[PDB]
Amino acid sequence: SDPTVFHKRYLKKIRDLGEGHFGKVSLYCYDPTNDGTGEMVAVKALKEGCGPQLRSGWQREIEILRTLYHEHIVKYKGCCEDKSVQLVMEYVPLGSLRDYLPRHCVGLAQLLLFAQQICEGMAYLHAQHYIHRALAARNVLLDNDRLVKIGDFGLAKAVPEGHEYYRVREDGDSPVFWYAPECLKECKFYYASDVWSFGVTLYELLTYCDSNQSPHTKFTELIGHTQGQMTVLRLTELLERGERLPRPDRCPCEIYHLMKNCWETEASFRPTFQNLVPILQTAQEKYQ
Ligand SMILES: O=C(Nc1n[nH]c2ccc(-c3ccc(NS(=O)(=O)c4cccc(Cl)c4)cc3)cc12)c1ccco1
């Protein structure tokens, strides 16, 4: 049989795994032969209420993941056709860094190794000419042997042929607290804009995804209670002014400087994912 065809009749829902604004990801057992064991798979589906523009983007998302092959990117397994389409990916037993970090003992060197694998997947993603737009700890997953896998591509976009950015409009609903000022102000999401999001993800790693130190709580503390384009505006006001997330508790200064370098106001002055890989390898070596 075609390894990419999953018939609904052999899919059995275990539990939910994650929920975004547009999609839902659940764990299923695939057992065509009713053998008791079966194969565990993650199935992502578009929520009811997504209009034709979201439905088209959903087709492009499935196609982007079909295309990506990297050790630090969640593997595409196939599709489940109804009348709607569900995206079948591999099951990664350790979950997201947002759910793994608050309850596990993770030393600085292992945190830096996690950050490195993110960069490796991210450098491959940028080489294939794609931007991610949602690089947050919650979208980074751990497989067997704590092997990192970027797990969600819902906002990923193809960067046109010879361009350094994709023009993407209005949304105070998107991960705005992980966003560089240039895509908040100019609606231009550069390759360097994803590097800014890495800096925030590294901050999340160093705060062990502590909800009290979270970008939401820290930026809500400054901006207050805001929604939509009001959040986008108030944040832009803070960022190009020079305001950045604080140095997390127990974070060595040189790591915070790495965060700050990913947070340069001028997009062209931020390191590339290609440059970040050896920097983190050395940082990883420095501590144990
Ligand atoms: O989670 C597991 N196992 C997985 N195996 N395979 C997977 C593929 C993707 C996800 C996944 C990806 C992203 C998010 N973030 S989000 O909730 O904010 C979100 C954002 C945007 C869209 C959607 Cl839909 C969800 C959550 C889960 C998880 C697994 C797991 C947990 C414990 C052990 O194992």
Residue numbers in the entry: 883 to 964, 968 to 1173
Mind quoting what the paper says about this structure?
Janus kinases (Jaks) have broad roles in immune regulation via their action in cytokine signalling. These non-receptor tyrosine kinases phosphorylate receptor chains, which in turn recruit and phosphorylate members of the Signal Transducer and Activator of Transcription (STAT) family. Tyk2 functions together with Jak2 in the signaling of IL-12 and IL-23 via its interaction with the IL-12Rβ1 receptor chain, and in the coordinated phosphorylation of STAT3 & STAT4.
The placement of this moiety is guided by the sulfonamide linkage’s stabilizing interactions with the NH backbone of Glu898 in the glycine-rich loop, and conserved residues Asn1021 and Arg1020. The structure of Tyk2 and Compound 2 is illustrated in Figure 5b. The binding mode and trajectory of the chlorophenyl is identical to that of Compound 1 and, as a result, the glycine-rich loop adopts the same conformation in both structures. The furan substituent on the hinge-binding 3-aminoindazole core was well-ordered, providing clear evidence that the inhibitor soak was successful. The furan occupies the extended hinge region, sandwiched between Arg894 and Gly977. In the mouse Tyk2 structures, complexed to either Compound 1 or Compound 2, the steric bulk of the sulfonamide chlorophenyl moiety occupies substantial hydrophobic space under the glycine-rich loop and would potentially disrupt the His/Asp “glycine-rich loop lock,” thereby creating a larger active site pocket. However, the rate of degradation of the enzyme to smaller forms (<27 kDa) is reduced by 13-fold. Our proteolysis data suggest that the conformational flexibility of the kinase, other than a ~2 kDa portion of one terminus (likely the N-terminus based on the disorder seen from residue 870–884 in the crystal structure described below), is decreased by the binding of these 3-aminoindazole inhibitors. We obtained crystals with a kinase-inactive form of the mouse Tyk2 catalytic domain, only in the presence of an ATP-competitive 3-aminoindazole inhibitor. This crystal form provided a robust inhibitor soaking platform that enabled structure-based drug design of Jak inhibitors.
